[PDB]
């Protein structure tokens, strides 16, 4: 949710 994931 708040967790960041880089889409690239």
């Amino acid at each position, epitope marked *: 949710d708040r967790v*960041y*994931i*880089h*889409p*690239f």
Partner: antibody
Amino acid sequence: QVQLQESGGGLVQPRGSLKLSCAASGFTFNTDAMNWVRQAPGKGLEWVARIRSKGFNFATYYADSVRDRFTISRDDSQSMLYLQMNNLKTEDTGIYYCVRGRDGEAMDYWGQGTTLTVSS
Amino acid sequence: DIQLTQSPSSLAVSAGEKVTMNCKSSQNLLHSITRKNYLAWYRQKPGQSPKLLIYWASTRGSGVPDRFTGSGSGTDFTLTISSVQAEDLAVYYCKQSYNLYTFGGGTKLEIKR
């Protein structure tokens, strides 16, 4: 080794279509994001398309150049990373490597890279 | 947007030497809520697909030998190689993954012999 059998591509006339078919195997395809990178004979590399996994509703990012013309697409069950080229120009001529690359990491595995030619 | 510039474009060296490349970014690549420098380094052997060498600016890819050491943060990232084996001949590129991708011009490594 994790392979990436990339059938498709060859000589095509300008304004014509085409649709490559990257079929990888060796890792868990449905869970990883894929990409398509091209290389104009001689020059460097150029990222062209990206389709994020099911987890992110098959999100897609297209480089500016191929925008509104190319359509990356996948089919998890058959491990098929497709790409629909339309309104081909002379520039699009080149090698189209198909590579898998997990979110936020690196372009882990590059395939062989089929050829594509656009000419009258 | 992100425009990568390498230097030197061409470099010649003899077997067994410390070669240093260089990649300079237009916009910062260090991500705030990740503290990672999304900048990778790939090499392409003549007549082969690009092979990954370094990611996150310093982390080495699986199976990549010790010879290759990525370095840098922000915008001035450097690729460094020690004991350049003959086999090291290929073109070296630096891509960016901060916001989409923008491969670098490249750097051809020729072997003086």
